[PDB]
């Protein structure tokens, strides 16, 4: 039996058909939908410094400043931008309406370029998750709400429990 074994023999449970019963293969609907459906919002101003890294870890999904960078390094990510202000299609020329990323390290150039995100910032990683974040500049806020109870209290009074 052992000495007369058959070099290159198949398996038992997996003799051609591989499908467990834990749920791993049981794909609900779409990958993006469940796992990669987390979104957070952070101050648009500090986003200008790092394109992929800062946005992903700091903003919405993880401690990955360290981990995230690795992913970027991994080069298994994409980046998109879509505020919805202009009607200027991709036009290749570093569009702002829509953005696509090769996930190669670009700190300032790429960030500011697409991460302008007046209303939208999106980050997607194919290693595990996609995180999308919306960012608005505090200053901008001042402009719209420039005459609300928000500025008066915060700035003028500046004596509220929840500090800015």
From TrEMBL:
<feature type="domain" description="Tyrosyl-tRNA synthetase C-terminal">
    <location>
        <begin position="30"/>
        <end position="152"/>
    </location>
</feature>
<comment type="similarity">
    <text>Belongs to the class-I aminoacyl-tRNA synthetase family.</text>
</comment>
<feature type="compositionally biased region" description="Polar residues">
    <location>
        <begin position="6"/>
        <end position="33"/>
    </location>
</feature>
<protein>
    <recommendedName>
        <fullName>Tyrosine--tRNA ligase</fullName>
    </recommendedName>
</protein>
<feature type="region of interest" description="Disordered">
    <location>
        <begin position="2"/>
        <end position="33"/>
    </location>
</feature>
